[PDB]
Design an enzyme around this catalytic site. Structure first.
Site, mmCIF file in Angstrom:
data_model
loop_
_atom_site.group_PDB
_atom_site.id
_atom_site.type_symbol
_atom_site.label_atom_id
_atom_site.label_comp_id
_atom_site.label_asym_id
_atom_site.label_seq_id
_atom_site.Cartn_x
_atom_site.Cartn_y
_atom_site.Cartn_z
ATOM 1 N N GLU A 150 -3.957 -0.313 -9.631
ATOM 2 C CA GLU A 150 -3.531 -0.311 -8.228
ATOM 3 C C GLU A 150 -3.449 -1.722 -7.653
ATOM 4 O O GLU A 150 -2.494 -2.084 -6.967
ATOM 5 C CB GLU A 150 -4.477 0.535 -7.393
ATOM 6 N N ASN A 154 5.528 0.613 1.079
ATOM 7 C CA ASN A 154 6.265 1.720 0.484
ATOM 8 C C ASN A 154 7.616 1.864 1.141
ATOM 9 O O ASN A 154 7.797 1.484 2.294
ATOM 10 C CB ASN A 154 5.465 3.010 0.631
ATOM 11 N N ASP A 183 9.121 4.232 2.437
ATOM 12 C CA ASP A 183 9.092 4.994 3.681
ATOM 13 C C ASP A 183 8.478 4.324 4.898
ATOM 14 O O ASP A 183 8.434 4.955 5.977
ATOM 15 C CB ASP A 183 8.370 6.324 3.442
ATOM 16 N N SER A 235 5.261 3.171 5.211
ATOM 17 C CA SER A 235 3.820 3.056 5.074
ATOM 18 C C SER A 235 3.481 1.868 4.170
ATOM 19 O O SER A 235 4.363 1.306 3.510
ATOM 20 C CB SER A 235 3.214 4.339 4.529
ATOM 21 N N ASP A 241 0.226 0.409 1.437
ATOM 22 C CA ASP A 241 -1.000 0.653 0.668
ATOM 23 C C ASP A 241 -1.890 -0.591 0.724
ATOM 24 O O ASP A 241 -1.384 -1.742 0.583
ATOM 25 C CB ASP A 241 -0.677 0.917 -0.797
ATOM 26 N N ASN A 298 -3.203 4.462 1.355
ATOM 27 C CA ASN A 298 -1.917 4.515 2.068
ATOM 28 C C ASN A 298 -2.101 4.796 3.572
ATOM 29 O O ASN A 298 -2.878 5.662 3.952
ATOM 30 C CB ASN A 298 -1.049 5.576 1.364
ATOM 31 N N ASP A 338 -9.721 15.674 -1.497
ATOM 32 C CA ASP A 338 -8.683 16.333 -0.681
ATOM 33 C C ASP A 338 -7.981 17.489 -1.391
ATOM 34 O O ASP A 338 -7.239 18.241 -0.746
ATOM 35 C CB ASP A 338 -7.649 15.301 -0.204
#
Ligand SMILES: [Cl-]
Ligand SMILES: [Cl-]
Ligand SMILES: [Cl-]
Ligand SMILES: [Cl-]
Ligand SMILES: [Cl-]
Length: 129
Positions: A35, A46, A48, A50, A52, A59, A101
């Site tokens: 990562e 990202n 879109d 967002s 990280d 994120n 989650d």
């Protein structure tokens, strides 16, 4: 901060990540390797909109607030900048929520693509833990 491999493993263990949700320490070290290359300050946008953040590339679409991800949530109740600190506490606490989650570590696409199923113990090999 750029951690060494065993140094990060120790820090992760100190913060209760060793076998958290059944994921051995090597899984977490491997995830961090791919990562962030162990760099606490890593950020990546990202497509879109967002971003990280940090050692585990958490994120802003769901987990932290950065003020520029329209329509997003902050489920870790933290500013995304807290995920960039030399001290990994905030990233660990938030990762514990993410991994709980429902999909386990598959939340980290790089873990799924590069760590899952592999000899993840190699990541803690030789470490005094
Ligand atoms: Cl390494
Ligand atoms: Cl392991
Ligand atoms: Cl936002
Ligand atoms: Cl730390
Ligand atoms: Cl699981």
């Amino acid at each position: 901060k750029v951690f060494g491999r065993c140094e990060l493993a120790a820090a992760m263990k100190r913060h209760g990540l060793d076998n958290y949700r059944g994921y051995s320490l090597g899984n977490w070290v491997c995830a961090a390797k791919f990562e962030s290359n162990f760099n606490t300050q890593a950020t990546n946008r990202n497509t879109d909109g967002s971003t990280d953040y940090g050692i585990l590339q958490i994120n802003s679409r769901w987990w932290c607030n950065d003020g520029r991800t329209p329509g997003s949530r902050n489920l870790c109740n933290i500013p995304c900048s807290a995920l960039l600190s030399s001290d990994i506490t905030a990233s660990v606490n938030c990762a514990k929520k993410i991994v709980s989650d429902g999909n386990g570590m598959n939340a980290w696409v790089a873990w799924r693509n590069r760590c899952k199923g592999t000899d993840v113990q190699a990541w803690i090999r030789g470490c005094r833990l």
